[PDB]
Amino acid sequence: ATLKDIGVSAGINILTAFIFFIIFAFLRLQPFNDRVYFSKWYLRGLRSSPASGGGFAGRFVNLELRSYLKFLHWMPEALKMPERELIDHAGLDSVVYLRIYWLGLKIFAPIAMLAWAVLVPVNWTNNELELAKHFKNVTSSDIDKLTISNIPEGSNRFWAHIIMAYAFTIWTCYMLMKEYETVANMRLQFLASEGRRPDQFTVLVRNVPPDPDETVSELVEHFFLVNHPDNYLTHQVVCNANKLADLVSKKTKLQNWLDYYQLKYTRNNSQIRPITKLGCLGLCGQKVDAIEHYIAEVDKTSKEIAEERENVVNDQKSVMPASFVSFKTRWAAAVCAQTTQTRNPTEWLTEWAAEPRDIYWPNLAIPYVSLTVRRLVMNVAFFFLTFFFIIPIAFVQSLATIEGIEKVAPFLKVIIEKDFIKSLIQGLLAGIALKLFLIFLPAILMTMSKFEGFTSVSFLERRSASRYYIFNLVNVFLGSVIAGAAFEQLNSFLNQSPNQIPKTIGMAIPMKATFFITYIMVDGWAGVAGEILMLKPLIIYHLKNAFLVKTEKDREEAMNPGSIGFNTGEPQIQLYFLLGLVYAPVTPMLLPFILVFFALAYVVYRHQIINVYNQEYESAAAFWPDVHGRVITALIISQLLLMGLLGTKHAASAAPFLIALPVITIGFHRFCKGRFEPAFVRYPLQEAMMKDTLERAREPNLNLKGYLQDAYIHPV
Amino acid sequence: ATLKDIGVSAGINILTAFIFFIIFAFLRLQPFNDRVYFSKWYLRGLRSSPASGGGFAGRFVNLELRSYLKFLHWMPEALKMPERELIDHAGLDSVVYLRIYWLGLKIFAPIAMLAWAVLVPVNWTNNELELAKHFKNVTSSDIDKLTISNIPEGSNRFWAHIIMAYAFTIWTCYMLMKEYETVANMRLQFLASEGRRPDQFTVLVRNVPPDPDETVSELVEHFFLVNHPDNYLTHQVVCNANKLADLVSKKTKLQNWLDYYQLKYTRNNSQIRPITKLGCLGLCGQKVDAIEHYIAEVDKTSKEIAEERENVVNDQKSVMPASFVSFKTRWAAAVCAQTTQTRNPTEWLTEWAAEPRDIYWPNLAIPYVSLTVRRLVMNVAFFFLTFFFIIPIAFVQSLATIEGIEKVAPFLKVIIEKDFIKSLIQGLLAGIALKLFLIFLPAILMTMSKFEGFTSVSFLERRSASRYYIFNLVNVFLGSVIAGAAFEQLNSFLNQSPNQIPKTIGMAIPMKATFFITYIMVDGWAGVAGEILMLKPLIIYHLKNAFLVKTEKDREEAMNPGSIGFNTGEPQIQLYFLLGLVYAPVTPMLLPFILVFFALAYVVYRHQIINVYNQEYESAAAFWPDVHGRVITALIISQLLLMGLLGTKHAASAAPFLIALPVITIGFHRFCKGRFEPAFVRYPLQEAMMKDTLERAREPNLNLKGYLQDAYIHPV
Ligand SMILES: CCCCCCCCCCCCCC(=O)OC[C@@H](O)COP(=O)(O)OCC[N+](C)(C)C
Numbered sequence A, B: 001a002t003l004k005d006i007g008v009s010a011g012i013n014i015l016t017a018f019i020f021f022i023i024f025a026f027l028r029l030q031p032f033n034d035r036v037y038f039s040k041w042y043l044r045g046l047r048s049s050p051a052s053g054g055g056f057a058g059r060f061v062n063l064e065l066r067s068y069l070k071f072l073h074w075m076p077e078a079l080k081m082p083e084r085e086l087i088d089h090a091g092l093d094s095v096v097y098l099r100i101y102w103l104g105l106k107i108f109a110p111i112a113m114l115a116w117a118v119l120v121p122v123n124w125t126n127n128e129l130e131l132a133k134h135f136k137n138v139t140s141s142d143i144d145k146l147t148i149s150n151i152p153e154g155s156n157r158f159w160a161h162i163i164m165a166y167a168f169t170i171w172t173c174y175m176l177m178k179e180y181e182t183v184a185n186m187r188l189q190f191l192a193s194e195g196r197r198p199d200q201f202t203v204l205v206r207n208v209p210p211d212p213d214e215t216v217s218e219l220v221e222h223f224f225l226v227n228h229p230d231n232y233l234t235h236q237v238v239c240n241a242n243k244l245a246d247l248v249s250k251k252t253k254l255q256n257w258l259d260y261y262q263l264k265y266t267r268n269n270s271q272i273r274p275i276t277k278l279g280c281l282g283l284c285g286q287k288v289d290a291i292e293h294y295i296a297e298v299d300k301t302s303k304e305i306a307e308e309r310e311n312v313v314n315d316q317k318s319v320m321p322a323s324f325v326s327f328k329t330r331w332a333a334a335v336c337a338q339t340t341q342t343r344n345p346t347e348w349l350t351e352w353a354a355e356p357r358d359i360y361w362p363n364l365a366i367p368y369v370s371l372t373v374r375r376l377v378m379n380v381a382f383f384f385l386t387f388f389f390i391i392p393i394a395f396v397q398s399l400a401t402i403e404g405i406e407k408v409a410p411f412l413k414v415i416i417e418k419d420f421i422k423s424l425i426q427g428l429l430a431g432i433a434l435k436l437f438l439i440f441l442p443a444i445l446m447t448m449s450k451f452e453g454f455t456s457v458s459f460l461e462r463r464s465a466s467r468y469y470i471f472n473l474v475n476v477f478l479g480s481v482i483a484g485a486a487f488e489q490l491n492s493f494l495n496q497s498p499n500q501i502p503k504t505i506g507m508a509i510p511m512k513a514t515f516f517i518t519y520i521m522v523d524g525w526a527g528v529a530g531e532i533l534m535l536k537p538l539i540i541y542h543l544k545n546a547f548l549v550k551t552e553k554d555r556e557e558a559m560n561p562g563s564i565g566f567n568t569g570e571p572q573i574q575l576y577f578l579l580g581l582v583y584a585p586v587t588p589m590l591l592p593f594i595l596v597f598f599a600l601a602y603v604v605y606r607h608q609i610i611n612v613y614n615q616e617y618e619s620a621a622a623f624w625p626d627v628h629g630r631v632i633t634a635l636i637i638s639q640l641l642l643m644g645l646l647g648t649k650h651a652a653s654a655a656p657f658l659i660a661l662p663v664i665t666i667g668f669h670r671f672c673k674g675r676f677e678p679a680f681v682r683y684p685l686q687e688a689m690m691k692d693t694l695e696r697a698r699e700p701n702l703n704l705k706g707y708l709q710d711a712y713i714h715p716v
């Protein structure tokens, strides 16, 4: 895995990224895409059509004379928009995400320089890995002599590792507190200048207590007109368009899926009959005939739709025990969100409402007790997923440590591991397998967050990211560590005795570092570079437009871009931060790769937040408190592991120092928490009065009951 | 320590309590005390003077013909006032304290019956304590064969212990949740009917941010008139009047002191000259001469006392960055206490104010940063006190395990521990020594709570009780356990080998139980019975009245009773609950003694809450959340210790069951918490509006700015 495998992976990966960048140039210079690659410039009313208004080309005939402007330009230009002109083109959230990448860089760049110098020198001048291969059968290479494991048991050269660790934790923590403050100040300034949104005045009251002679709405009016007497303006109840909406949706699906097999070439048409109960399928069946999904799955749907409408809207059997109450001021609404209203701690429970567009309406109609049982069931499913994944994870770790599995088992083999280009290619293949598994993980975890019952689309994402973190941690990190350890040094474990289990464990942790390096390379580099091409979103449009088009004009738009994830992306940045801290005080060579990822990523994503991407909710940066927490967790795990390894190499004249480390970390956490979290979780009342008195001097007229009344209704 | 020592202690203690009760009868039938023994009947305007209006006797001449009405009566009668006529004679707090004693009884009575039956039988039919004295030198008696230690290693009779443990934890937890609800409902109903107090409308704002052109009061008016615009009525600033307060104090001391040395017999008088720098003293010195602290001292103090009044009432150098703001409604004030006011999380910080009489004004004039450093310094002092106490604690535990210290050291000895009445008397003496040390502890801990900076006299008490708990736990319990263990089985530890350290530890835990029994007896029984006599408060009055009297009439009153403590008392109840749980699943014989304490105590204290005692603040039961927590802690420690002992006797076919136990305990804690703590820590807004709308219909006129303006001023 020495320089050979690292170089092969690196060559292949840099090549993949350059090929990507070339195909992207090509595809972004053809004027039939355009609305796929420059969509927030069109969805902001600022770009018109193909060739500056369209009607023209720029396609393939000469297409492109050679260019070094095949890259670079996108690069520098993404770099040049001030960061305050980006808060208003894009939003605060996007800007705070790019900030995460830059904090990474900060921390790590300094740590890397230092590490390298001090520690590589120390570790390299020191002999104890050649002696264990010759007297204890521990397999190793020459990339392993810049690690904490070429160092003899018996210190005096372990103190470097401890001092460096201290330096590193202090730097990380300082940098992290400075970012907390910036992000807080920014949030507050944004919040003070954003224009009316309907949720700066509304709350969601959940658990209105039942009665037998008053409706839900005659009980919500009477409570707030007696208890919040001067500022109360209106309310809107919660009902079940769950079924009504399901039918409107089936109708849309039928019409799409059949105005297709309707204007196929015009005229009378064909047939199909897929088995329809799970997914995919086609022609395996009996539902022949034709057009409009027999225009009549078309019209039966429409009739059920009208009847459902009726029942719902006329029945107080479909009103849920909850409402959305609005007030005349933003000061009054912030007092109903942070105050207790009744003596029963579970009834009448106010919070702040989300913006009417970050509401997942399908879970506003789920009872409250169910909420608790559901949460439990989902925690159980999580534990089981964690176990099945351990299975696929070791499968991967057996392809990566194959040259040691083929020593205590000189059996099947890649022609007995000769033909050495093949084994480096095996390091690359291990990477690709883990990639695959982890894709479907993101989607499953979102489905499990939408069951436990949340009702904002921004909290479902935050939850999903937290769960990915846990999964990632355990599984990837530790599973890989454990299994890889097993295999190579399994060879060594058989032909020795059960004490050497520990020492062998220490050295194997540093080798798993080397595998992590390769994975970073694949994932990081190539993925950030292949994200620039938007390929599912490009096929998707072109198929769409030469199939289900029949556009009235061009007003029929199906370009919709997407949004950063929060989910996928944050989970990745965090895995890489963990890796980095841990390996900084052990193998100081994962750092250069971590850094290339952070920089490319910042450049690609600024481009995609500026040209493509559009945000679907605005919660001025709350995930910050969450991100900070996850970095503090990494720091603690790192520190505990260094203690462990230092114990395995018998150095007791240094581990209490490592203990002070952990305590200093938790103390800084607590400080930060205090100050800045207050900023992110509680709306001051002086801030709500200043926004409110400056808008009643500018718009001295304003009727708020027009605007706020119907903003929280549904598909009605 | 068998039946012999237990019986001697019990006889002597029951005798002491009966002698006490007799002397109390005597002293409560003489009509010169009366105002010492029936003071809340005089301080409520309901009793007049000595013999029904006084002027008469009932003293010593025939004094008392023999009576069996020498006791009993106080007993039944304390029992007969409904518990709702006691909420208004006395207050809610006192009633909730007596409830603690009754919960004790509940839990333990059931647990005791069960224990006894099942476990004593099981443990007694079983041989393994006679075999270890004959083959491992473990000293023991015959009271030890009803303990978990006459049971052979190897279970099948340890399962009883585990089942019983489960039963016991469930019962405790059920009982505890039912009390939570009662106490919560009671608090809420009280709070809804109590008449105006000035703090139902006021808050304390601490940390008003400095300026260079506006005073503290022109900055508190402007903030609340712009930010809480409609309900704001008044404010009163905080000034350091620590020095004037101190000189008024020195003046009263001088006059009292020496209007005494003045009317000694009238005329020209004597002299004195104590060393005056630390305390006590008399005649060792030079300050001779004459009457009322050389009346010139009394006037030089009244010079400073009028020129301190000027440099304090007109300066703005003695105004502290804080105020007390009042509002026109109780709904408005509860919104300022539970809401954030500014973006700087450390400035402008509102809470609810205490009643103007539960304010410790001396610490309202301490800066805020100091508050944090002070807290740290006091935590350090706590750790050191804990260590010195370990020293006196083992001294005590060496007098209690003397018959085993005099085996591996047949030396000095009580005439070689013969004369056996003497060694039982040593069990009683150990008890008395611990009593002594622990007295001065209560007072020290209060002094340390008044340094860390609190400003209510009710929180200083709560803090002091929590600290006593920790001290008690560690020191008493564990120190005693450890040291006692050491001594007896030290004998056994020398003449064996360092593996038998563990097994010997198990058996010694059960013997320390027996010593705890004796301490309970002394402390509990005799102390509750000697508390009925109020002897420092009786001497104190009689000296006072035949010395510093010269009463204008009788209006000069110096009877002041006191108040329950909260401090001392709660700390005791909790030590006994701990002991009980722990020993219930091990030595099932501490329980009968625990119970006698709980019952006597309830009877004596009801008497003293009904006749003597008067409350100095009213915080309708908040210490409840605190008490509950401490009982949950006991449950957890108990459970962990049973696991330990069961491990020491090699029973692995039962300890995971013990683990489930701990988790079930924390779950019930969390439920309770949720519901009822909300009740005790947050004032609902529907409750404040109902109190406010029913008082504006009864007293339709009411000016609140008269009443609320000057309630928060000082010695001015
Ligand atoms: C993630 C870690 C969390 C907390 C970290 C502390 C846990 C680890 C601390 C100790 C780890 C290893 C402890 C250690 O001491 O290992 C046991 C060694 O002493 C065993 O040495 P041996 O080679 O068996 O010595 C005997 C050799 N003959 C066999 C005596 C030659």
Ligand SMILES: CCCCCCCCCCCCCC(=O)OC[C@@H](O)COP(=O)(O)OCC[N+](C)(C)C
Residues within 6 Å of the ligand: B499, B500, B502, B640, B641, B643, B644, B647, B648
């Ligand atoms: C407060 C407790 C917190 C948690 C509770 C768990 C901690 C205690 C759990 C184990 C306690 C004792 C554990 C135990 O296993 O003791 C060690 C014994 O196995 C020693 O047995 P020995 O008599 O040394 O056996 C060897 C005998 N020769 C010497 C082999 C005869």
